[PDB]
Each structure stands twice: as C-alpha cells, then as structure tokens.
Amino acid sequence: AQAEQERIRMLSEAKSQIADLVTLTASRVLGAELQARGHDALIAESLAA
Amino acid sequence: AQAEQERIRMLSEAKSQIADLVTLTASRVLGAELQARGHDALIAESLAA
Amino acid sequence: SGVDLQPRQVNVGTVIAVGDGVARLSGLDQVVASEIVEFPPKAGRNESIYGIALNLEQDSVAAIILGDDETIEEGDMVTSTGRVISVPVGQGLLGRVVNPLGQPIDGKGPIVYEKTRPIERIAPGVITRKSVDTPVQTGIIAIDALIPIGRGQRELIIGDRQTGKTAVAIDTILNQKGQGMVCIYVAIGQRRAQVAQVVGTLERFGAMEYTIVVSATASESAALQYIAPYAGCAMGEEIMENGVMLNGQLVKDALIVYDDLSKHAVAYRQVSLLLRRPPGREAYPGDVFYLHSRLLERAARLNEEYGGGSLTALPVIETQANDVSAYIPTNVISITDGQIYLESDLFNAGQRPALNVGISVSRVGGAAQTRAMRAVAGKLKGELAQFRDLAAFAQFASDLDATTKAQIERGQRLQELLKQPQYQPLPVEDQVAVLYAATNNYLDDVPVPLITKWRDDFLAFLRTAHPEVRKLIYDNRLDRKFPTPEVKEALEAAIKEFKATSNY
Amino acid sequence: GQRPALNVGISVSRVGGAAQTRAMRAVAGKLKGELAQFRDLAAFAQFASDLD
Amino acid sequence: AVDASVTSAIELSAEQKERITRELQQRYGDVHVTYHVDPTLIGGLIIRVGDQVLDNSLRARLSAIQRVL
Amino acid sequence: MPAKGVIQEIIGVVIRAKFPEDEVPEIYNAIEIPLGNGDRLVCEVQQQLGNGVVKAVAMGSTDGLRRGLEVIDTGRPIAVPVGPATLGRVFNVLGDPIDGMGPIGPEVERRPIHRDPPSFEEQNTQAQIFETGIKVIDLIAPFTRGGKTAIFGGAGVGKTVVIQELIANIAKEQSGFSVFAGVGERSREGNDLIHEMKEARIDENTTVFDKTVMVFGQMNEPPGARLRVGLTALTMAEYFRDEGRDILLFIDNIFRFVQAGSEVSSLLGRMPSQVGYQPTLGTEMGELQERITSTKRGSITSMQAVYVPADDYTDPAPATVFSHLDATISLERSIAERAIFPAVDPLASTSRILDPNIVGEEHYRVAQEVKRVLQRYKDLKDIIAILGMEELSDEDKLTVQRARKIELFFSQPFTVAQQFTGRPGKYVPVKKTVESFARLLNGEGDHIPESFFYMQGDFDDVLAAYEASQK
Amino acid sequence: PAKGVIQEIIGVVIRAKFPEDEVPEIYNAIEIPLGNGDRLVCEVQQQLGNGVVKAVAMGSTDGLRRGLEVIDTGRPIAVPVGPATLGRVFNVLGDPIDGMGPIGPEVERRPIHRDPPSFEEQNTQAQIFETGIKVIDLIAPFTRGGKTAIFGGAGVGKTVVIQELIANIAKEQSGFSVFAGVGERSREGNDLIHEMKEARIDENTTVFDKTVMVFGQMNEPPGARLRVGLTALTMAEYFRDEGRDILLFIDNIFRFVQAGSEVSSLLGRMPSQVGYQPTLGTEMGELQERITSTKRGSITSMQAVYVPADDYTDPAPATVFSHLDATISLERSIAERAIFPAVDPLASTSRILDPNIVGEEHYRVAQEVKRVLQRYKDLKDIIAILGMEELSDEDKLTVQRARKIELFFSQPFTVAQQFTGRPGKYVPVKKTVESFARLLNGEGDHIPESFFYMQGDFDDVLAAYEASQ
Numbered sequence A, B: 001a002q003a004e005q006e007r008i009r010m011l012s013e014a015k016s017q018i019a020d021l022v023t024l025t026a027s028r029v030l031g032a033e034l035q036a037r038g039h040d041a042l043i044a045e046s047l048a049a
Numbered sequence C: 001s002g003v004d005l006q007p008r009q010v011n012v013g014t015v016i017a018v019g020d021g022v023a024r025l026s027g028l029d030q031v032v033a034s035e036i037v038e039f040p041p042k043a044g045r046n047e048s049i050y051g052i053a054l055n056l057e058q059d060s061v062a063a064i065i066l067g068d069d070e071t072i073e074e075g076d077m078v079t080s081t082g083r084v085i086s087v088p089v090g091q092g093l094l095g096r097v098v099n100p101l102g103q104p105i106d107g108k109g110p111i112v113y114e115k116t117r118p119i120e121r122i123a124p125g126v127i128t129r130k131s132v133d134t135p136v137q138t139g140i141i142a143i144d145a146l147i148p149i150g151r152g153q154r155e156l157i158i159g160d161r162q163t164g165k166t167a168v169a170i171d172t173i174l175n176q177k178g179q180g181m182v183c184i185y186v187a188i189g190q191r192r193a194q195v196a197q198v199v200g201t202l203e204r205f206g207a208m209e210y211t212i213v214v215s216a217t218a219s220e221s222a223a224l225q226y227i228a229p230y231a232g233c234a235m236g237e238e239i240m241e242n243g244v245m246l247n248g249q250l251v252k253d254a255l256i257v258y259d260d261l262s263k264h265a266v267a268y269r270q271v272s273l274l275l276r277r278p279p280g281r282e283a284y285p286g287d288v289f290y291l292h293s294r295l296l297e298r299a300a301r302l303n304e305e306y307g308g309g310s311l312t313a314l315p316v317i318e319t320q321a322n323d324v325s326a327y328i329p330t331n332v333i334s335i336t337d338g339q340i341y342l343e344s345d346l347f348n349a350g351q352r353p354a355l356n357v358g359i360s361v362s363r364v365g366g367a368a369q370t371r372a373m374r375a376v377a378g379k380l381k382g383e384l385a386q387f388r389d390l391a392a393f394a395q396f397a398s399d400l401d402a403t404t405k406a407q408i409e410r411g412q413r414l415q416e417l418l419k420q421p422q423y424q425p426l427p428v429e430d431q432v433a434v435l436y437a438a439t440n441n442y443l444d445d446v447p448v449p450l451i452t453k454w455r456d457d458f459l460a461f462l463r464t465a466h467p468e469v470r471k472l473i474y475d476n477r478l479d480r481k482f483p484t485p486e487v488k489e490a491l492e493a494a495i496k497e498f499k500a501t502s503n504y
Numbered sequence D: 001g002q003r004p005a006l007n008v009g010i011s012v013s014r015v016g017g018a019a020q021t022r023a024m025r026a027v028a029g030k031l032k033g034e035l036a037q038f039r040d041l042a043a044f045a046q047f048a049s050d051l052d
Numbered sequence E: 001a002v003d004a005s006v007t008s009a010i011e012l013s014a015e016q017k018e019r020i021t022r023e024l025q026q027r028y029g030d031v032h033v034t035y036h037v038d039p040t041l042i043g044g045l046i047i048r049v050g051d052q053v054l055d056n057s058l059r060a061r062l063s064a065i066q067r068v069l
Numbered sequence F: 001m002p003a004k005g006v007i008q009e010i011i012g013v014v015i016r017a018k019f020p021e022d023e024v025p026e027i028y029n030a031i032e033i034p035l036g037n038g039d040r041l042v043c044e045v046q047q048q049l050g051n052g053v054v055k056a057v058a059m060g061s062t063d064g065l066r067r068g069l070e071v072i073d074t075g076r077p078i079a080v081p082v083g084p085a086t087l088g089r090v091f092n093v094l095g096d097p098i099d100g101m102g103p104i105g106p107e108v109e110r111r112p113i114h115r116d117p118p119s120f121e122e123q124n125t126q127a128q129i130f131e132t133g134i135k136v137i138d139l140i141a142p143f144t145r146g147g148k149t150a151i152f153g154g155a156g157v158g159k160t161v162v163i164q165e166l167i168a169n170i171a172k173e174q175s176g177f178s179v180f181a182g183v184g185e186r187s188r189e190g191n192d193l194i195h196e197m198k199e200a201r202i203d204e205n206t207t208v209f210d211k212t213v214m215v216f217g218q219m220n221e222p223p224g225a226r227l228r229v230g231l232t233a234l235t236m237a238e239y240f241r242d243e244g245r246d247i248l249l250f251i252d253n254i255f256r257f258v259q260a261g262s263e264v265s266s267l268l269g270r271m272p273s274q275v276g277y278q279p280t281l282g283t284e285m286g287e288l289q290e291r292i293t294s295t296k297r298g299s300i301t302s303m304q305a306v307y308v309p310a311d312d313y314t315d316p317a318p319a320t321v322f323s324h325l326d327a328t329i330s331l332e333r334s335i336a337e338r339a340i341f342p343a344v345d346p347l348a349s350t351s352r353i354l355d356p357n358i359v360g361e362e363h364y365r366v367a368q369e370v371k372r373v374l375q376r377y378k379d380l381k382d383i384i385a386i387l388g389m390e391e392l393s394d395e396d397k398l399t400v401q402r403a404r405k406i407e408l409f410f411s412q413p414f415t416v417a418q419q420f421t422g423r424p425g426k427y428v429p430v431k432k433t434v435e436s437f438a439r440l441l442n443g444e445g446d447h448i449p450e451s452f453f454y455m456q457g458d459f460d461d462v463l464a465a466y467e468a469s470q471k
Numbered sequence G: 001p002a003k004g005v006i007q008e009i010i011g012v013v014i015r016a017k018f019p020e021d022e023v024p025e026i027y028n029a030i031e032i033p034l035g036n037g038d039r040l041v042c043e044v045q046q047q048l049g050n051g052v053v054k055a056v057a058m059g060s061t062d063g064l065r066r067g068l069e070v071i072d073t074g075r076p077i078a079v080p081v082g083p084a085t086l087g088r089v090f091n092v093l094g095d096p097i098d099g100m101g102p103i104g105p106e107v108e109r110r111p112i113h114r115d116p117p118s119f120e121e122q123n124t125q126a127q128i129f130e131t132g133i134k135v136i137d138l139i140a141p142f143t144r145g146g147k148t149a150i151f152g153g154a155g156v157g158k159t160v161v162i163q164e165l166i167a168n169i170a171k172e173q174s175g176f177s178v179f180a181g182v183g184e185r186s187r188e189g190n191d192l193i194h195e196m197k198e199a200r201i202d203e204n205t206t207v208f209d210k211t212v213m214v215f216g217q218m219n220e221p222p223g224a225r226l227r228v229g230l231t232a233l234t235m236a237e238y239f240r241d242e243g244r245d246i247l248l249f250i251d252n253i254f255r256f257v258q259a260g261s262e263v264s265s266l267l268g269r270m271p272s273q274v275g276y277q278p279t280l281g282t283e284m285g286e287l288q289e290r291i292t293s294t295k296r297g298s299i300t301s302m303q304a305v306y307v308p309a310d311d312y313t314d315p316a317p318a319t320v321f322s323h324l325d326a327t328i329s330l331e332r333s334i335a336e337r338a339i340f341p342a343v344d345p346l347a348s349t350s351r352i353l354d355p356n357i358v359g360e361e362h363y364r365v366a367q368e369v370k371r372v373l374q375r376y377k378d379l380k381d382i383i384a385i386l387g388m389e390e391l392s393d394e395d396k397l398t399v400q401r402a403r404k405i406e407l408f409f410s411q412p413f414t415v416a417q418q419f420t421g422r423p424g425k426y427v428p429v430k431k432t433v434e435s436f437a438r439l440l441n442g443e444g445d446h447i448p449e450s451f452f453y454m455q456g457d458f459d460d461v462l463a464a465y466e467a468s469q
C-alpha cells in the first residue's frame, strides 16, 4: 500500500514537473513574442486605475 | 519505468507542451492572437533544447 | 489567463530592515493587523515569501516572515494582500502531512480541496455549545477509567521531557479507528525525524486513513511555529461544523493534539522579543495566556442546533524538572478542563503509562464515560485513593493490621492492573470486564507480579472462548443500571471459568 | 590537621600523568591504590575489631 | 508624488515617456515620475502612485509560475 | 460623539489612538472602533500619552483593524445595563447580551463600570449570618451577610459546583437574587453546565436562571475584558443593592482576575512588580473588593472562588485577596476523592463571623466541639493505622466513630449534582444543621452505622433512612 | 564588489554602511582587508536600514578602527567539500590550519547555510549500534543513523566517553567520520584526538585518513564558535548526500549555544530566560535538523552537551533534549563516587529501547534494571537516616541489587588507563544483557559489591571473586 502511495506520489511529481518543465516552453516564447509581437508602445491604457 | 513514459510524453513540445503554452501566452499577453506581430519563429523554438 | 484586466491597486511598502525573520515594512498603510504580506518575487527569486504584519507601529509595519528571510533584502517591495491566513479544509486533508500554511510536505501530491478556513476565529459561542456526554475512548485503562476524556473536552497532557506524552497522544489517536472520529496531530517545534517517525507509526496501524498532520519543525521559522496550532484547529473546526465523510458515515467529531504548546509558547516568545514587545514573566509576552486560550476555547461540543459536532483538544506541555508551577504550564493548566500528569519516577518504576492519578484531574468526570465504566470505576477510584492515602505504611511498616494490609494489597493489584504496553489499546468492553473482575474480588487470589499477565490472558480468553460476552457488554454499555442479570451472568461465569481453567 | 588538604577522591589530573618522573609514578601507583583502599575502608572503620 | 514611478521592460524614449506622464492626469496631472528600464518584466507596465501599485506587466499576467505549476 | 480620532498604533491588544488636543478622552473612557460589518470594537482607555494620544486595551480581537481607522469617544466609561432587564440574561464585559435573546433596549438605565465604593460612614458593622444550604459551610465557616467569602482548592475540587449550588439554593429556598461574574470563565463551565444547571424550577414556572444575572468574561477574551468583567458584574449588582435588596455576587474565579491584570500591565509597558506581576495588584484587588460591602440601604454579599496551584497560598493571587475575606472555605482533593463531593476541610476553614456573640452560643459550641473531635481524629486515624481500634482505646473508639460519622455527615447532595450522581438535592437550614450536629455529637447516633450519614440532610433524614432500612 | 565602510565596532559585531543598491544579503560574507594581506571574514546577520548591516567578526576584531573599507564577497561563507577534506583540519571558514597545503580551487565550495532535509527525505530506519559500553548499550542504546547526545556537567566524563566511542567504533566505519570541536578546549582535541586518530590503523590507513576535523575551539571569538558547527555539517553533508555513512562527533553543542548567546547580546536583541538569545530554538533547529540521516545516506551523530553548573533545566540543554534519538545523562554525584562512566540510568533514555527493535530480553533486562534503580532512588531517604535494617527483606534485596548494578555500570576504558590502572575493556551488547540478567536473577548476591567495580561482563566479576575467594 505504501508502494502504491509512492507510485501515486511519483505520478503527481511527474504532473508537477510537466508544468515545471513548461517554464522554458512558455517563458522564452513570451519573451520572444514581447520582443516581436508586442514591439513598442504595448502599454494599453490604464484608465480604470 | 512509469515516470519514463511521462517524461517521454512531455519531451514532445508541440504535442502537449508548446500548444498550451502558446495559447496561454496569446490569451494573456494580447487579445487572443497566437502570432499577432511575431512569435512565428518562437513557435518551434520555444523550448530551444 | 483569467486576468480581469488586472486593475487592482495593491498597497505596497518597502523593506527597510530585515533581521531574524522579522522585517520592518516602512509605509504600508491600510494594512490589517494580521494580513498576509506577499514579498513578490524579484531578481534571483522565483517564489513569494509570505509574512504576518503583526506589529502596526506608526510609520512602520513589523512583519514576521513565514519562511526563509535570507532572500529578503532591504529595499524589497512588499504588497499587502487583503487576505488573512487561511488553510485548506475538508475531505482531502485526511492522510496528508501539511505545513501550517496548508502546503503538503509528504510529497504525495497537491491537496484536493474547495474550502479555505481562516486559522484565527472566535470560539463557537455561548448558546452554541452543549454538555460533554460522549466519551473519547483513549484505549488506556487508566485514562479511560480515572481521568476520562469526552468529546469537546480540553484535556492537557503535562509531563517531563521523556515520560510518554506523545505515546499517550498517539495511542489515543490509534484507538479512534472505528470510533467515527477524525484525529489531527499538530507537531510544533518537533524535529522532522520525530514527525516522520510519528507518521510512520500512524501508517503502520492504519491510523492515517483518518488523521491529518500539521507539522512545523524546529528548523522552520518561528512564524510558522506560531500559526502551527491555529492551522489544524481550523481543520478540526471544519470537521466539527461541516463534517467529513469517513468509512461511509459523516463524522463531525475531531480530536486535535498539540504535541508541544511549550514549544509554541517558546516560538511566540521569540516572535515577541524580536518584535521588541515588552516581556512578562520568564521573558514571555503579556498576551501568551491570551494566545493559548484563544487556541483552546475553540475546542467545543456544539448542540444539535449547530450541528452536534465536537472538537476535542489534547494539549501537550513539557515541564522542566517537574515544575508545573511555571508560567506556560500554569496557563495551560488553568485553561484546560482537565490535566494528565506524567511522572518519570512512576515511568521508571514499571508504571508504563506513568499516570499520576493522585494529581491528574478530569473536570468532566463521569459524563465523559460510558455507564458501564461509571459503574465499574467508582470503586476503583475509591480504592486507589485509599491506597494513595495509606501507602506511607507500605515500604517498611509490615505488621499494620488486616484492614490496612488488605487495602494496600488491593491498591497494589489495581495499580498493576493499570500498566499497559505501548501501541496496545484496550476496547471499552475489555476495560469494563477487567475492572469488573478486579473490583468484585475476583483477583484477590492471583498474586501481584502476574496481574497484568492475568489481564492479558483474560482478554485473550474473552477473545477466543467468549466473544459473545464482549458483544453483549458493548451492546448495553449505555444503560443506567449496567450490571443487569443478563450481563452480570456470563461475565461472572466467564471470570469463574477462566480462573478454573487457568492456574493463577 | 591535614594542612595540604588534598581531596584525593575528587582531585584529578587529566594530563600530566604521562608528564611525571618515572620514579615518582613507580612509587606513587601503590600509594594511590592504597589510599583508594583506605578510602573504601573508611566507611568500615566503625567496628570493634570485627574486620581484621 | 515622490514615490510615483513607471516601470516597463523595454527602454523608453522621450515621446512615450511624456505620453505616459500625460495619462497620469487622473492622479495629480503631471506627476513627478521616475522610469526604470527593468528588462525582466517581459513586457507590460508597472505604475506606482504613492503607496499603490498597478501591476499590468505580462509577468504578473502569467503570475510567475503558471497556475498549473 | 464628543470626539473622533484616528488609530496610530495596533500592537496586539493595545491601541494607540490620536485625538484632538481639546477633546482627548478621559482615563477610563470607552472608545468605539466601527468595523465594516455593522458592529464595533470597544476599547478602554488606560493612559493619556502626550498630546492627544491615548493608549487603550482592546477588549477584542483587533484582527480587522488598520492604522488611521476612525475612533469615536463615548465621553464616559463603559456603560452596562442595570435593572430588571438584566435579570435572566447573560452578558459580557461590554454589557451586550451574548445569549440568543434580543438586544437590550435603549430605554433601560446604563451605568458606568467604574464607581467609587461606599464611604466609611456607610458601612454597616452589624454582622449577620447569611443562611447557606450547605451543612459544613453553615457550621464551620458561616457565610457573612455583606461580607466577602472565598473558596480555595486545586483543580476539580468542586468550587464551581459549590458556587452554582449556592446560587440554586439561595434562589430557590430564599428570595435572594444573584449576579455571577465569570472572570476567565471556561466556555464549558459557563456556556454550559451553569445555564443548564440554572434551569432548575423555583416554584412552578420560574427557573434559577430567570432570577439571576450572568456576565461572562470568557477565557478567549483579551485580558482587558477579563479584567473588567468583575466590575461589570459589580455594576449590575449595585443596582439591586441600591434598591434595598440584599444581593448575592459570585465571582467564579479570583486568580484569573489577577492574571488578567498582570497581562494588561505587561502589555501596557508598566514596570513589573514582585515575580513579574502588576504594580497595581493591591489597588486593583481593593477596587474590586471594596464595592462588596454591607451598607445601610442594601448589601452585596459575595462568594469568590480562588484556585491555589498545588498548595501555594503565597502566590500573589491568593495573597492579595486574603485581606478582603470574612471567611475561607478550604477545599481538599483528598476529601473529594473519598467521595465526599462537598470536599470542605472542616479544619483550616475559618470565619470571622464564627463568634458566640453573632451566630449564637449553641452554634459556636457545636462548631468548636466538632472541630475538636475532628482534630483528635486526625491523630487517632494515624494511631489506628497500625494498632487496630479494637486492640486498645480509652474512649478513642467512641470519638473515632463520632468523628467518622460527622465527617461523613458533612457531605450533602447538591441540587446541581444530580447530573454527577442522581441523588436529589437537599437544603438544610442553619438552625437544623447545628441542631443535627448537636444531636449527633452526644449520643443518639452511636447505634446508626457510618453508612446512613453519607448523603443526607438533617439528622431526621439519617434517622428516617435507618428505620427505613430496618423494616 | 560593493565596497562599504565600517561605522561601529561593538565587541565582535561590526556595523558597516553600504551603498543603497549594493547592500549585502542576510547571511552574506564580507571581508575587512585588515592589512598585511590577510582578511577578516565577517558574516552578516541583519540589515538595519539605508545600507547599514551588522556582521559577526569570525575573528579577533581587536585592532581595527572605524572607517575601514569592507569588501562584500557577494556570497555566504563557502567551505570546501569532497575527498580533499579527508585527513585535514579546518577552520570556521574552511581554511586548513594543519601543516599541509591549501585546498585547491578545483575543489567544490559549498555555503555553510543550507536548508535542512525535507520531510520526504527523512529516514526512520533504526537498529542497534553496538558501542562496547555496558551502560550505553543497555540503558540508552545507540541508533545507527540516529542522533544521540551525552549531557554532563564539568568534571564528569564527557570527553572520555567521546574518546572511548571513537576508539571503539571509528576503526570500523564503512564510511567516513567528521569531528566538530566546537569549544573543545584544544588540548583534549587536536592535541589528543588528532594524535590518537593518527595512531589507530585501519588496513594500513589511519582513522584520521578518513576523518574530517573542524575546530572552533574555546580560544576563538564567538563568531567562529557560532559558525564552525555549520561548517562541519556542510562538510559532512557532502559525504551523506553521495551515500557514504558518516560518524559525526560534535563536542559541546553548548559552546555553540553560548557563542550564539554572546553574539545576540552584542547584537542588541532582547534576552530570554537566563541571558539567552530570543532565537535559541530556531538556532538549535537550524544546526540540529541538518544532522538528521536521510534516504541517500546516514549520519550517526554523537554530540556532547555541556550543562552549566549542574542545572539540567538550563535553556540550552533543554532545547537540545528534544532533538535526539538517544539521551545519556552524566551526573556529578555518580562521578564523585568513582563510578567514572557516570551515566544516570534513570535519566538516560533511548528511542530504540523497544522489544521489537533491540530484542525482548534486552528490553526486559533494561526495564528491570531501571525499575530496581528507581526503587533504590525511592528508598534513598529511608536508607539515609534509618539505615538498611528497617527495610523489608524484598526491599533489602532490591537495594543490594541496585548498589551492585550501580557499581557494575562502571567500566574500564581503553583511553582511561592513566586514571584507573586497569586495561581497557570492551563488552558486547549481548554479553551486557546476559550479565545483567544473571545479576538480576540472583547470581552474584553472595559476591560483595566491590567486585562489581570496573569490570567487564559477569564472568570477569566471577573470576575476580574466585581469585579473592
């Protein structure tokens, strides 16, 4: 039963590391997009506050 | 051995790691534009590994 | 990604002085007196370290840091999130070891939950509560017979550094297997290896099917140890108010064990002294009695209007050289509805549970006992009191008379009856059967240095020859006149048969 | 009257035992042993020749 | 006023600087504003007026680690 | 609203608030902090620090407060309701009803917490015995009318049960009302087990609860609330005193009042005194106790429970109250464990009113002789521990038998003890108990064994039990 | 980098001002050039304001003025870790002090301030660790990979027990050992421990050849004593993390606590209890939680704890008590009675003293010995004034057995041949259990008490009694 619990823990760790390894899948893409798609003057208008 | 399969599945970028990250970046950074004024080269070079 | 244009004007301040887990936050106006300050991630740091804005001085906010303060530097920005400290509560906390912030630390995965309860709240009230009636069967015959604990009772376990306080608490937690009670074990200041050993003990006997562990180890910050018992108390409040499914029934009864409120008071004293608050006795802050009482008045027994649930508190206090007259021991003794005194002198003298029945008190009393235990425990308590009285003439005065020698010897047999091995709880039917055997002169022939063995073998007899007697006793343990002729027979008969077949 | 009131029972020397003249240690091992015997027999020095 | 600051990720020229300071007519007209280059914001804007911060940065929109993390 | 200030500092349960310099609140004034829920937090001023800044004790959580919050001064100290509207209700330190009943209306009189005690010339020196329903309390340490009486014991000896039993007895068998001050009241002892135990019918449709007032300064309250709850109950009882009625006041614990004072003084930054206690311990205790006096108009007569840790009577909490007592009832755990649940030790239980000129010559003679025979038995029980009673005795058998019979006869079943035992309660008049002990003292009880004296009323009940057994 | 200026010098606490954008971190290390080419490596503890930090000297700081420049290293105190640290003697800063050359730059440097192992890493596996000492192996058995401590006063044998443990177990380790001499007095340490560790040979390699030694001795200022334990723990954690078993001996943890107390007094913190730091519990947790054995590797810790005066209620030993798997208490009364392994059996406990872990007979024998000694302790007041004659026959037998047990716990040590003129004696745990079972059974009742003093197992007592005959 403890081995089954440890297997479930390893599955949860893999699920968490899927997002942890998705740090490079999102951060670099967002940086490149902000360098290219955002370009300059992409500050919108903070009229609400 | 079970975690090896999950790692191999997560190793694919566009299958389950790059598409979701690209969609989230499109939804958050701008008004739901996957490319907008760029991000074409970063679609396949997001992981850069 | 779910952002609503992000227009929130969060109030911010700057760290002007960070010391020993305490940071001065400079201008952080409109902050509530116990908010969570965020410390947003910065260069070289990808995580947020939360703090508790305790000291709201003029033009200064002194906040204790719930984590490592080494990464917090002077000039760092802090944002005053409007939320007070809250922890996840519900069904998903069962079987999980979490830190006082609710984050899981056993590595088994994220906590599944939908409700967050604040760790700080007012006690259930005045018209909310009800008289304590349902017993908490600890499985220890001495406690369950002489210092009973009921559902909704604050029973202190006070003792020396190594006397069995954690053992008593763990045995009590283990005994609530099919009793329909959710146990919570808050580890305050304990070493992480000891908490791991406690969790392993609970897993060995299957107690983690219904147990939540909220541990703040010694290496963690004093801020985490300070909110360590209030978290977990929130979980017990949610269990006693909303209920939780367990073995197919909606359990609304909780048993919370603060394994060190002495260490909790030490952590709060460290917090107060680092905040430069005025000291009191033994350098403790003035509001250290207000602290524990605020924690311990939340253990209630609600009436049927408010759910009928209950939260049972088992504070644990470690005294130095059996000095129960210190500040924190006197505070917790005054707050609690009963005390369990454990002595190292009794522990070394063979009395393994180390119950000091003479000074241990249960203010609930017979209301926290089954009617069978009430019937079979009054004579036991009276005889033990007589033995404690005239035990002075027992070491070297040997002549005495027939009456004094008989009372001394009966007290010795009853004291030997109360000795229990660790991790071997006794069911209430077994306890009342053994106490009926002892109190009705059925043990007057078997010598003293076999009594415990006798008890064990008798229970084995009742577990093999006559299980129906145990079932009969357990079925009618609640009637006012417990020793009915149906139950008095087949129990006296069982005792006589066992005494006949077994030479003792 | 024991003016050099050395409490031989509790006075110790953690080092310096090796830093002793071999003559002194050779003639003082027996002295220390017999002083220990005398201290052991101090409690028994209350009997009217019951131990001889 | 003295604590008012505007912080983006990209470096600013005078035109967008004065355009940003024009927007702050909501608080005190032409408020005393300091700018910081801070290239780690990954786009967006941070506006600190007095003791209040509007964090419109895309890093804040991504909330650092993704909610899935 | 005389003045409105702002909160400057929030340190635990201590609030520093800045007020206009010409409208600073007074020393014991009450200041209300309005919260965003329709309720308010009432703090009590304690000091005036410099120019318009006041330090106040919170009397509340202060977990919802921020700096700069509006604070409305009330101009006067905490005002609590007085009158028949408070009768049959449960209050807190602020006078707000904490029971399920509706809030007290604005037509009732509200009196300030802090009031000067009666003057020297108003003291009624005429000592009068207050009839309690307890045999041992009547005989050994009689209850003085208009005086202050204390109960001392460890934990679980029976102080709270005794207090609520006097409430029930003096409300049922007498017309005297009662006011209860749960200082540091445990939420199990106060929220239950006293409300339910005061649902005992008086005559047909009125319970003891309906004729009593309760003010619970609970344990989870901040130290200021537990400090001023006693004065709140005193203010509530002083209305009934001023009406000419002889009012009864039960302070359920004294050492918790001392602890609350010590915590309040430590939190305020005052210099510690003695073993870390407050410098104003004697003054605070005097301010509480001196309002409980017998005046020409009425009389507040009080019983105050005191818990001595272990056997230490030299701690500041029992030492500061000894000067204010007219009688002490010393509860013992040894007597309690001997199933004598009213575990009063007849020895070491004194009273100033136990004088032949006050309680009568017969009462004094009976009490003194009972104490003498019990003192003799205190040595004779040791003597007979090894040398059996039948072996040798020069009138020692008779005096041992009489002493055992009277120490069992001191035990009395309580009305509020039906939950613990099931035996119905008994009330004995002060005349009947002294008459019964006089009858039992010289013969007339030597033939009845020491089993019919266990839980009885007067000697007539013991007899009726004996000839009921011999049928 | 980030050059600042010294503002104040109070004791070993140096308050230095830095530029606003270059303030050192909380546990960052800052060097004062001090002249002559040798620096003083202070360690920051607090940040006070606009670039103002407070640091602990880690050195003499007795001849440096205000206004001196301070160079921020930008990183905490880094000490070398690896096989290069085996057979070497180090400082608080990781600088070798022996005659050997300096540690090369290729050796990995690790910060001395690391997070303790998490909850998932903890290893609860426990088994008997035989030491050869009767009272230790019977009453408070050692745990392999578990934390044990030897409390004691001043003149009791703490260092002698540590030396005997090293002489008994460090020749067979299957791993490495680390010795942290925190306030060790430098005579009974490197002058003696290092000399005896180079004399013990393990398969043509000395014990010292597989031992790291880090010495924050008593002569050092409070900062060196305050961080030397963490330095030694950082050096031991490398061998633990790579799977090697570690035998960790830290001598006088109380010296660590006292150094922390002196620093806190100089740091302006408000004291708690008897002049101790407010952060005593957190400091104890920071040092002690890094000592725990994990799943990757095991550390078998054996700490010594000094007790001020003889007060076991002092905050420092009291904080140590809850961090242990086995506790040994040394009493001055037993030591003055010449029972030099002066372990109090009633005040010494162990976690693995369980019939499932150590054995049914071992548990029964230990519990009966403790029960007999507790009965003796209860009857001490009777014996003191009335004498032995008033007791009952069973009580007389119990007291005689207890006196024989008290004398029998004394054992001659290999490192204690100078004090007692007897050869060192090693007694296995099985022989200890059998001998005490025979003593409790009734054998040896005819033997006088003096034949149980400084012996091995029961066979040695029998042989001595037959020789006397």
Ligand SMILES: Nc1ncnc2c1ncn2[C@@H]1O[C@H](COP(=O)(O)OP(=O)(O)OP(=O)(O)O)[C@@H](O)[C@H]1O
Binding pocket: C159, C160, C161, C162, C163, C164, C165, C166, C167, C168, C318, C352, C353, C420, C421, C422, G322, G349, G350, G351, G352, G353, G354
């Ligand atoms: N009934 C018992 N029978 C046998 N051994 C017991 C019993 N109760 C406790 N022990 C012993 O107590 C130890 C367990 O720790 P214990 O429960 O005494 O801790 P504690 O009193 O809470 O204090 P701390 O955690 O500070 O050491 C073990 O050595 C165990 O053998």
Ligand SMILES: Nc1ncnc2c1ncn2[C@@H]1O[C@H](COP(=O)(O)OP(=O)(O)O)[C@@H](O)[C@H]1O
Binding pocket: C362, C363, C364, C365, C366, F153, F154, F155, F156, F157, F158, F159, F160, F161, F162, F189, F307, F341, F342, F413, F414, F417, F420, F421
């Ligand atoms: N008159 C009585 N009859 C039976 N039991 C009593 C009586 N008085 C006290 N007790 C016992 O004492 C307990 C209540 O004690 P309590 O008065 O609350 O303690 P304290 O004196 O510390 O306030 C009850 O559980 C009950 O068992």
Ligand SMILES: Nc1ncnc2c1ncn2[C@@H]1O[C@H](COP(=O)(O)OP(=O)(O)O)[C@@H](O)[C@H]1O
Binding pocket: D012, D013, D014, G152, G153, G154, G155, G156, G157, G158, G159, G160, G161, G188, G340, G341, G411, G412, G413, G416, G419, G420
């Ligand atoms: N096993 C032993 N045999 C003989 N003498 C001992 C033993 N242990 C300690 N001693 C005595 O104790 C002294 C050493 O005490 P030590 O352990 O150095 O004190 P500390 O506790 O300060 O380290 C020695 O002088 C020695 O006489």
Ligand SMILES: [Mg+2]
Binding pocket: C165, C166, C259
């Ligand atoms: Mg414990």
Ligand SMILES: [Mg+2]
Binding pocket: F159, F160, F189
């Ligand atoms: Mg009470």
Ligand SMILES: [Mg+2]
Binding pocket: G158, G159, G184, G188
């Ligand atoms: Mg030493």
